[PDB]
């Protein structure tokens, strides 16, 4: 049978498949190559995906979101007593484990982390047996390289839940380095520097003959793309609340329609200097507009960004490595697209320039795919 490759990340999945000789990063439903990883049990529905995340704003406790961050771990450990003071959906003490309480059509149902996981896991078996039109039973699912033998295996239950037999866990570094083709011939060692939505991960990866090994990893759990829009979103609401005595953190459909021009406003600014945030009507009668400059954008988070380097000290104090050592810099996650970042990984390496994709929100989804092709031969 065919064999997909899912990155299931913390915020978004990603599934792609390997056939007639390419790797296929396929849209869900509403056209996209990245999934909110949402769920949501409002009103005897249950929606996956973005349609889940809508739900988010106003029932905040039966949208379900993050459980990447408790699946395998245990309710005690101070990861995830951090959580649950985070989290707006009630998280309960299953025998020592951290489980997800809900109401569908009123009652209580409690669901494992890999239950939820699993209908995550559904939607991306359904979009690749679509596009394949073929059932998928077969599956490479990334994981990052902290992850503990449990939290690998409540991600392969979460696989079985799914229908997926999980035939291979890869490592998020070892995904990104089959996704850039790294050159698997003698000793290269690579610093992998993943910021996504929600999450910063930092580990060497060494290629040998072949043979990859994870030597360190460390990262910040809280610090991702999400945090800096969150820096924005704090500015313009002081200056909406200066300019006209309205605070727009009183009307949670307000704070939504922000918080999406302002992560659109945060990828222009990516490429362009200057860009408009407009919302009409952002309550009724007042208009939101507003100018965002990169330099802006740039002083609202500059500590955030340099944060990702205390991380990137850490794995090479862990390997005992010097930062001549590192041979090759690979950039994943949709937030190293900010220029700013690239250029502070680069002053940090004392000049060394890192190596980013074109979709580097996609990169891990895509090594996924290609040792799904490696496994199949
Ligand atoms: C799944 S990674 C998606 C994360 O990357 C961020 N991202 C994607 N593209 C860009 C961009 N062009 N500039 C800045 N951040 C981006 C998104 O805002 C989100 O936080």
Redesign the pocket.
Known sequence: GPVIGIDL?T??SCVGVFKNGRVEILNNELGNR?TPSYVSFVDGERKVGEAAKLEATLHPTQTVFDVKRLIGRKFDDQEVVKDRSLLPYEIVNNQGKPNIKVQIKDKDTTFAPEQISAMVLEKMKEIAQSFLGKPVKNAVVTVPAYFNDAQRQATKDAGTIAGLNIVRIINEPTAAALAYGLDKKEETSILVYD???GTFDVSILVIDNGVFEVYATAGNTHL???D??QRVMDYFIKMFKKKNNIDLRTDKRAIQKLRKEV?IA??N???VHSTQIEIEDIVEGHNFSETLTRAKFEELNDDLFRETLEPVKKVLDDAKYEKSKIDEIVLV???T??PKIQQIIKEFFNGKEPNRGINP?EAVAYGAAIQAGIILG
Request: charged share 30%.
């Open positions: 990340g915020t978004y990245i910021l996504g939505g991702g793309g999400e800096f829009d992560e945060k990828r600014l990516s490429v996650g949709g937030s697209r900010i929100d």
